[PDB]
Design an enzyme around this catalytic site. Sequence first.
Site, PDB file in Angstrom:
ATOM      1  N   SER A  17     121.222  11.231  57.446  1.00 23.94           N
ATOM      2  CA  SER A  17     121.349  10.910  56.109  1.00 23.94           C
ATOM      3  C   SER A  17     120.645   9.601  55.850  1.00 23.94           C
ATOM      4  CB  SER A  17     122.653  11.246  55.583  1.00 23.94           C
ATOM      5  OG  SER A  17     123.231  12.519  55.838  1.00 23.94           O
TER       6      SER A  17
ATOM      7  N   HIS B 249     118.059  17.840  57.621  1.00 24.91           N
ATOM      8  CA  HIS B 249     119.323  17.528  57.155  1.00 24.91           C
ATOM      9  C   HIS B 249     120.078  18.420  56.600  1.00 24.91           C
ATOM     10  CE1 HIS B 249     121.091  14.790  53.801  1.00 24.91           C
ATOM     11  NE2 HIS B 249     121.831  14.606  54.974  1.00 24.91           N
TER      12      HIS B 249
ATOM     13  N   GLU C 138     117.331  19.918  54.209  1.00 25.53           N
ATOM     14  CA  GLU C 138     116.022  18.860  53.595  1.00 25.53           C
ATOM     15  C   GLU C 138     115.262  18.954  55.095  1.00 25.53           C
ATOM     16  OE1 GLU C 138     118.873  15.650  51.935  1.00 25.53           O
ATOM     17  OE2 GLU C 138     117.392  15.744  50.407  1.00 25.53           O
TER      18      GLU C 138
ATOM     19  N   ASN D 274     120.907  12.681  48.019  1.00 29.60           N
ATOM     20  CA  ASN D 274     121.741  11.582  47.753  1.00 29.60           C
ATOM     21  C   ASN D 274     120.969  10.697  47.009  1.00 29.60           C
ATOM     22  OD1 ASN D 274     123.933  12.410  49.403  1.00 29.60           O
ATOM     23  ND2 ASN D 274     122.732  11.701  51.247  1.00 29.60           N
TER      24      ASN D 274
HETATM   25 CL   LIG Z   1     128.358  11.264  48.248  1.00 31.40          CL
END
Ligand SMILES: [Cl-]
Lengths: 472, 470, 470
Positions: C118, C139, C151, C189
Amino acid sequence: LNVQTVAVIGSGTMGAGIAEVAASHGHQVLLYDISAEALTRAIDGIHARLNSRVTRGKLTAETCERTLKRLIPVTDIHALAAADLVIEAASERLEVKKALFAQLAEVCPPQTLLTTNTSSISITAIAAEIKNPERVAGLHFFNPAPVMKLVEVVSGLATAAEVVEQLCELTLSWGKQPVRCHSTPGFIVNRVARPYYSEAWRALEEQVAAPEVIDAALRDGAGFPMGPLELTDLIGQDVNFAVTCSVFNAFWQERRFLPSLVQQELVIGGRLGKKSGLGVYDWRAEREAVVGLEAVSDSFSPMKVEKKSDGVTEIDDVLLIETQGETAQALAIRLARPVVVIDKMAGKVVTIAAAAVNPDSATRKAIYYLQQQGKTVLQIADYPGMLIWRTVAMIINEALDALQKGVASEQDIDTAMRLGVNYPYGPLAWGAQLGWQRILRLLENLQHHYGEERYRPCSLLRQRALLESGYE
Amino acid sequence: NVQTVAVIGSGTMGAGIAEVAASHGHQVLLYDISAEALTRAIDGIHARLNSRVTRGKLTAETCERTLKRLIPVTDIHALAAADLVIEAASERLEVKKALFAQLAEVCPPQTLLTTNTSSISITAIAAEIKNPERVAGLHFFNPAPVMKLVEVVSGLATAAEVVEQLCELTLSWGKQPVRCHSTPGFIVNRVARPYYSEAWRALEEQVAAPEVIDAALRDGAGFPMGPLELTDLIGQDVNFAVTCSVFNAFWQERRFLPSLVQQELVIGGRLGKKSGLGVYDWRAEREAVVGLEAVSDSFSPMKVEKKSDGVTEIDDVLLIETQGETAQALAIRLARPVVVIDKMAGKVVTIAAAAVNPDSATRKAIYYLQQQGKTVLQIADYPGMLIWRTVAMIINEALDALQKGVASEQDIDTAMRLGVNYPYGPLAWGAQLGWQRILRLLENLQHHYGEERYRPCSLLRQRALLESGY
Amino acid sequence: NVQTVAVIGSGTMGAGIAEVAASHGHQVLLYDISAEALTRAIDGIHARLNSRVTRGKLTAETCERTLKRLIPVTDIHALAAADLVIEAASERLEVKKALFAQLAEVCPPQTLLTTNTSSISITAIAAEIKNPERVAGLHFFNPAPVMKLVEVVSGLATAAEVVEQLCELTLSWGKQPVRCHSTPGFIVNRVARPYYSEAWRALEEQVAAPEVIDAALRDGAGFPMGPLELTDLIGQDVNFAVTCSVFNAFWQERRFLPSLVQQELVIGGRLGKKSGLGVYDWRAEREAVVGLEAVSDSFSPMKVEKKSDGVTEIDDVLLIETQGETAQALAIRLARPVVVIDKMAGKVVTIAAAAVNPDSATRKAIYYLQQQGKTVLQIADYPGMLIWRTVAMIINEALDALQKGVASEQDIDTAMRLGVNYPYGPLAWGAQLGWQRILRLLENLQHHYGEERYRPCSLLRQRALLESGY
Ligand SMILES: [Cl-]
Ligand SMILES: [Cl-]
Ligand SMILES: [Cl-]
C-alpha cells in the site's frame, strides 16, 4: 484533598526549587536522586538561599529552620512509597521518563499523584503504559520555582478531573496560581509566546531596524518588560531555539511556528547570548541607550493639525496614519499626499516610517508634532504592520487559536501570559481593549501583502470581529 | 598572498579546481586517503590537457609545467606549507568537522581554509576550530575550468579581509567572484530552483511533451539548455538531491517543493545521460521540435490591430499575452474567441486556444504569428504557460534573495549570468520585463492555485509600486 | 494465460489472496520461510471455508476442490513454475527489493511479479530487477475474498500489455480492477483522506459530539459508516499510520495534515474496537442520537416562501444552505436572523443558529424542518458545516488525482464505490451537486481559514467555468 508527603525527583534547579516551595509550605519532602553528592549540593543551595532571606528579613528564622528540616534526601526509590504526590523533574528524554513512571507505578499506591515538570514531553505518552494512568498529570513550574507564581496543570488524555482539582487546590495552597490546559505542544505559555520572538527575527532578517530599536519599541512602546531579542540572549539562544523548533515540529511544521535562519546561525555558531558573552548582542561592553531623533526646531511647526478618527492625523498636507499593515508608500501613492506611518501604543517610544516619496520637510513636520507630545520618535524601514502592532496582533491571534482548539479557558490564557512571561495584558483582554476588527484588518493586510498562511486571521478572530461590529 | 594550494578530495570538482589552480601558477598539493585514486585523477587532467594543446590555447612547454605543479600527497601533516586549503571531499557534516579541527594546528594560524560545499553551512564547520575568521566557502561550478563563477561564502565569523583575499585570488584565476552569506543554496542553487521545478509541474499535469517545454525555454526565452534536458545532463540524482537539500534547509518551504515525477526517475535508476535514460532516451536520435504546419493564405486575417495591455485583435479573435489567466477564463468573460500567447524575444512561441474557440478562429492567430516568422508550439491551456511562469518565479526568487540580504543586486545578476548562463541577470531582466507585469502574473497564479508557492515577495510589491510612479 | 500462482506471505492478506486464487481454479504455491506459520494460514482458510459449507454458502465438492489447490512451500526455487507471483510480506523496502531480485533469476522472463503493498513505490521495487516491465502492484483490500476492488499499479517500467493481463485476470476473480500509477495512496487511500480529516478537525473545535458527526455523514450524506466510528473499526493506529504515510510522501502537504486528536488516542493506546475504547466506548452499548425535540405548533410559520435557491424565507428568519459562510456572517450582512442548514438526501440534517438570533426565530426554522420529516441536529456555527464540507473536500481530492494523471475519471469513481463503499463516485457526485457550488464553498472556506488546505484545485476551476455555459 490530603497531600502530605511530597516526593520531588531530580536535584537540578527545577527539582531543588520545587522542593523548596513544597517544604516551605509544611510538606515533608523526599528529594530523590541516585547521586548522594548531588543531593547534598542541591540542599546546600536551598539552605544558602533561605538563610540569606532571613538575613534580609524576608523570611522568619522559624519558618526557615522548619523548612530545612522537612527536606529529606533519599537515594532509594522505594522510600517514595509514602508520598501522596511525586513531582518528576529529571531527564527530558521520553524513554527515561517512561521508565521512571513505570517504576513509580509499582513503588507507590495507585492513589498517589504522579506528576512531571516537563515542558516538552506529552503527558499522554508518559502515562501510556503505566498502571493507573488517571493520576498522571503535568505540574509545570517556571524558573525560578520559588519566585514564579504560575503553574500549568496539564491533563493528558487519561487524566482524571479530580486529580486536576487536587493539583490546583494544592498549588493555590503553595501561593501559586494554577492554570489548566491539555497536553498539546507548548501548553499555553511556550505556544502563545512564540510570535513575540519570531516577529523580531523576521524584522531582523529584513534589516527593518537594529536589534536595539526592535527591543526598545517592544519594551518602551508596547510595555513588555524585556525586548524579544535581548530576552533570547538572556534565555540562551540554544534554549529558545530548541523550544521554537520543538513546537514547530510537534505541529507538523506549521508556518506560524517557523524557525529563523538568523537564530539557527547564532546557535550553530555557539553565540548563545549572555552566558557565552556574545549573541545578538555583545555582553562584554555594557548596554547602550537608544536615543531617538533630535528635536526638530520650532520653526518647522505645522500650520494646521487635525485629529481624524481611525488613527489618522492630518498635519498640513501630511497624513500621519497609525499602521493597519499597509506601507506608507502604498498609501502615499494612493492618496497623492505625503504619509508617515506610526506604530504606537501607550509607552513613550514610538516607531515611524516615511514613504520614500515624502519630501523631508513633510516627514519633519510629523516628527515635530510627535516630539511635542512627549514621544521618543525612532525611524525604521517602511515595513508592513511595523513592530509593536504586528507582534501584538500575532500574539493575540495565537491566543485565540489556542482558545478555539480548547487548549485552555480564556481566563487561564490571560493569566498564563501575565504570570509566566509578564506581558502587560493577557492577550485576550488586550485584544478586547485594542479592538477585534482592528486586529483583524491588520492581519488581513499582512496576509495579503506577504501571501503567507502565517498571517491568517484565525476563525475565532473573524468570529469576534463580527460580534464587535454587532454592538457598533 | 597564496603560493601553495591544498585541494582535499579527488572527485570530479576537486580535479577541475586543481587544474584551475595549477594553470595559473600555483603549486597544487592534492590530497586523498586512497593513493591509487590520486594518480587516477591526475592522468584525467593529463588526458584533458592533451587536447587543448592540439588546438593552440596552450603550448606543450606550459602544459608540462602545469602538470608538474600537481603534487599528490597521502599524509595530512605535510600540508602546513599550503597558504590556502580548498575542501572538496564528501558532503557529510562530520567529515568536515574532524578535518578542520585537525587543520587548526597542522596548518598555520592565518592559512585560509575553504570548502566547495553545495549543502553544508559554513558557520557549522567553523564552530569548534581555533581561528574562526579564516574559514569560508569557495564554491565552483561544473566544470571548474570552464565555468567563470565562484561564490565566496562567508560564515558567521569570517572576516572581511579574508573575503577580500579569496576574491583577489579567484580574480587572478580568470574567475569572477560573488559574495554571499551562508544560507541554503547560496545564490546560484537557490535562485535557479524554479527553472526546473516549474518544468516538473508542467510535466506532471501533461501540459506539453518535455521537448516542447525545453524548446520554449531555450529558443523562446533564450536559455542555453531547456530545464528538462539540463537535468538529464546534470544527472537526475544530483539535481534532485540539491532540490531536496534546499527544500529541507528552509524547513520545507513549498516554493522549493520537490517533484514526484523527478523522484520516480531517481528511485528507478533513470538518472539521465550517464545511465542512457532519464527524461529523454539518450541511446537514440532526437527528433527536432516540429511547430504547427503553416495555414493557407485563404485563412488570412482581414483586420489586425495592436491594443494596450499585450492584446492584439485579429478579426473576431483576441491574441492575449499571458497574465496567468486561462484562455477559457478570458473567452467566457470577454465573450469572444481567445488564444493565449507565451513569448519573449526568440522565434519559439507557445499558444493555447480556449476550448470554446471554433478551429477557424485559432488558425487566424496561428497564421499571423507564422507571418511574423515564429515557430508555434500548441500546448494545454495552462495558467501562466511556460516561459513567463518560469521567468517570473526565477525573478521572484532573486528578489527574495536580495530582500533577505544574501547578496547585492549586481552580484545576484552576475551569479545567474555566470553560474548557470542565464541570458540576462534576473533583477535586470525584471526591470526590462516590467515589475507590475511580473506582480500581476504571480498574483493571478496565486489566485488560481491558492498556493503560497506563488506569493509575490514583498520587494516585488515595493518595486511594482515604484514603477507605477514613473 | 495464467495457471500457477505463487503467493508470498502468510498473514491476513497472504491468506486472503491465496483463498481467492485457489477458489477461482489456480494452483496456489503459498510461500513462507516458516513452516509453523504456513500451517496456521491454511488452517484459517480451512476454518473459514468449512464454516460456509455448514452455513449453506458453499458445497462440499467445491470446498474440497478449492482447498486441494493450496500447496505450502518453503523453498523459493519451488516458485519457478508460477505464471504469477503476488507478494504480501514485510513492508520494509530492503527486504522486498532483495526478494524480488531473487525471484527474477528463479522465474522465467515472462512471469508476472506483483506486490500487495500500500505504501512502497513500484518503481523502487522494479529498479534493479531483470525484465522490469513485468513488475506491477496488485493491491487488494482487507478482507481479500470479500472486497471487490483491486488496484493495478504501474511503476515507471510496467508495460501496457502486463496491465491488461492483470486487469483481465482480476476480472476473472470476480474483482474489479482499477489502473493507477505508483503515487502515494494510489487512488483509494489518497482520495479517502478528507473523510477522516474533516471529522478530526470538527472534534478539535468541539463543533458537535462524535455521534452527531457520524450521524450526519452516515444518515444524512448516505455513507455506510461515519468517519469516526469507521476509524475505531479500522484501528486508530492503522488509520493514523496511513494518514501520516500519505502526508510524508507528499512532502508534508497540508491537505493531508495529521490531527493531534487522533495522535493522542494512538499514543494513549485507545486504538478503537480492538482494544475496547477509541473515539467510542465499545465495552458499553451505544445509543443512537435522538435529534432535537418537537417544537410546538405555536411557533408555526406565517408564510413559507422559497427564495432564490439555497435561501428559504420564513417570516423573520432565513434558512440558508451552507455555502461556507457562517450563520452569524450572513445574519449581520442580511440584517436578519439566519439559520444555516447542512443537508443532502437522508433524514439527518444539521443546523446552526447565528448568535444574534432571538431563540424564537431559531425555533421557527427548527419547526419548519421538523414538519418536513427531518431529524434536526444542532451544532456550532461552523463554516461549511459537516456533510458539505467533507464531500467538497473528497470531491476536490478526486479532481486533483484526475488532473495529476493518477487514474481515469471512471476508475477513480469505481475505486471509491468499491474500495470504501461510498454512495456515489466523487466525480459523478460533483457534477450532480454542481461544480460552481462546490467551487464557491471551497473558496469561502479558503478565505475564512486562510489555509492552503482548502484551495480549489485547478481542474475544479475549469469544470466550474465549463458549467457556466450550456
Ligand atoms: Cl485507513
Ligand atoms: Cl524560550
Ligand atoms: Cl542542480
